[PDB]
Amino acid sequence: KARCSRKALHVNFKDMGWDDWIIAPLEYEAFHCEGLCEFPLRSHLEPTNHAVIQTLMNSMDPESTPPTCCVPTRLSPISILFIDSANNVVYKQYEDMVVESCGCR
Amino acid sequence: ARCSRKALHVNFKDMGWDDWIIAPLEYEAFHCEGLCEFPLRSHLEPTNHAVIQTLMNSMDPESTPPTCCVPTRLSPISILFIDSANNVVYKQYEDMVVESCGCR
Amino acid sequence: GCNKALCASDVSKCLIQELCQCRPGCSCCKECMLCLGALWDECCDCVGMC
Amino acid sequence: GCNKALCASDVSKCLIQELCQCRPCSCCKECMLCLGALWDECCDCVGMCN
Ligand SMILES: [Ca+2]
Ligand SMILES: [Ca+2]
Ligand SMILES: [Ca+2]
């Protein structure tokens, strides 16, 4: 079981039933964050002081304190062409769609 | 049962930090714990990515893992300690107390 | 009251569009129903709008 | 290697102080001051062994 890292995640809109309102793109890579968040939390990613302390307590007694969790810390957008609820055609940039870096929190 | 903020008492002596932290000797930091399943409550302020991952996780949990319950807002606390240079410092440390949890 | 298997796709559709995110304490209470359409009756409980 | 049981307390002490967070170098020396005697036994925990 590797540590917190960014892993592949293929998003297919038709598989999700969104092919009836999303025109393009029909699929894109979104990635996801998964892995172990145990001491030492890698310091170059600048984890919050709370995560640092919680990880320490988790290392002291994992039975009593749970560890931090591997979640996205930096997300980038993608543009999508769809049909809104008013039957208008819209080309919008959706925020926080692709994961760029992971971190323990 | 779902993602929520729970109590977490931080005692510095228990962690071996009593040799450089003068005060406070303890404080409440709280922690985030709970399930992150559909529907994600909108007050959690989930990212558009988290929304999609939760949906995929709900369609086929075997292929996509769920999001995780982590802190979304944090407040600071002031601490009086002795740095590595034997100087006494009263500093406000950021991201010390959990104020709200959310699925990400 | 919320059929997760029936409402997962369409409810998420309206969320990423930044709909159904207001609280009835209301503004988006009507724009949300438009996005769900026929599934409003079967999925209103999923967003606490009923 | 990084001895977690021996280095957990003191290494975390230097992190919350915003030290040992650079990569090889600038902060490589302020970090060594914070670890002190545990520098030899805990350099690998922050990759500052040079
Ligand atoms: Ca559909
Ligand atoms: Ca000590
Ligand atoms: Ca030594």
Numbering used by the authors:
A (entry chain A): 397 to 501
B (entry chain B): 398 to 501
C (entry chain C): 25 to 49, 53 to 77
D (entry chain D): 25 to 48, 53 to 78
Q: Please, what does the article write about this entry?
A:
Twisted gastrulation (TWSG1) is an evolutionarily conserved secreted glycoprotein which controls signaling by Bone Morphogenetic Proteins (BMPs). TWSG1 binds BMPs and their antagonist Chordin to control BMP signaling during embryonic development, kidney regeneration and cancer. TWSG1 is composed of two distinct, disulfide-rich domains. The TWSG1 N-terminal domain occupies the BMP type 1 receptor binding site on BMPs, whereas the C-terminal domain binds to a Chordin family member.
Serendipitously, the TWSG1–GDF5 complex crystallized in the presence of CaCl2, and we identified a calcium-binding site that mediated TWSG1–GDF5 interactions at the periphery of the binding interface. Unexpectedly, the structure of the TWSG1–GDF5 complex reveals a previously unknown calcium-binding site at the edge of TWSG1–GDF5 interface. We confirmed the identity of the calcium ions by anomalous difference Fourier analysis. The calcium ion is coordinated by 8 oxygen atoms with an average distance of 2.55 Å: carboxyl group of GDF5 Asp416, main-chain carbonyl oxygen of GDF5 Gly413 and 5 water molecules. 2 out of 5 water molecules bridge the calcium ion to the carboxyl group of TWSG1 Asp34. The calcium-binding site is stabilized by a hydrogen bond between TWSG1 Ser33 and GDF5 Trp414, and other interactions (salt bridge between TWSG1 Asp34 and Lys37; T-shaped π-π stacking of Trp414 and Trp417 of GDF5). The mutation of the calcium-binding residue Asp34 to Ala in TWSG1 did not abolish the TWSG1–BMP interactions, indicating a minor regulatory role for calcium. Since the calcium-binding residues in BMP ligands are conserved, and calcium is ubiquitously present in the extracellular space, our TWSG1–GDF5 structure brings this ion into focus.
